[PDB]
Ligand SMILES: [Ca+2]
Ligand SMILES: [Ca+2]
């Protein structure tokens with residue numbers, strides 16, 4: 001007769017819950033399970049402004065949906081309060097949700113547009129420009145690899161550091177401006193992503 005309050009029976013409450021950041025919105029991520037000694041019909045929910053922004057809960061079935069895209073690069077851990085109610089009380093428990101990473105970012109260049117003026121007598125070996133692309137993904141998918149695409153016979157860019165170096169004698173009267181495109185890619189062994197950036201190398205000859 002005196003009501004007994006519901007309690008959760010999911011094990012994840014003791015451990016945690018992992019959701020991949022590429023889980024599309026609408027996907028069910030789990031289903032809350034609760035027990036009630038009175039066998040009252042229960043209603044489920046999620047509490048908290050944040051938790052409620054990213055997660056929705058089916059009140060009768062306790063199925064937990066993904067309401068907003070998860071983005072590990074922005075927030076990688078949630079503590080969410082789930083609620084269960086027999087209509088006489090509301091009981092609450094927090095679970096930790098780790099958002100798993102995916103290579104979902106192309107490298108992104110900084111300090112564009114890229115242009116450099118250099119004299120034609122610039123010696124082979126001279127570093128003339130630093131290119132910089134960042135990639136916020138974890139592991140190989142956030143580790144960037146520079147290259148010229150297509151390759152240049154006059155210039156080389158260091159794969160690790162993005163330092164563009166002159167590798168062959170320049171000749172103003174042949175070429176007075178090169179239009180190279182650099183390719184930054186991450187190194188996800190299976191599904192890499194990549195971005196292109198133009199580099200203007202313009203040659204000068206003051207001693208006509
Ligand atoms: Ca009850
Ligand atoms: Ca990436």
Ligand SMILES: [Ca+2]
Pocket residue numbers: 021072073101102103104105136137138
């Ligand atoms: Ca990612």
Ligand SMILES: [Cl-]
Pocket residue numbers: 006007008009091092093
């Ligand atoms: Cl509980």
Ligand SMILES: [Cl-]
Pocket residue numbers: 072100101102103104136137138
């Ligand atoms: Cl990631």
Ligand code: NA
Pocket residue numbers: 021070071072073074104
């Ligand atoms: Na992301």
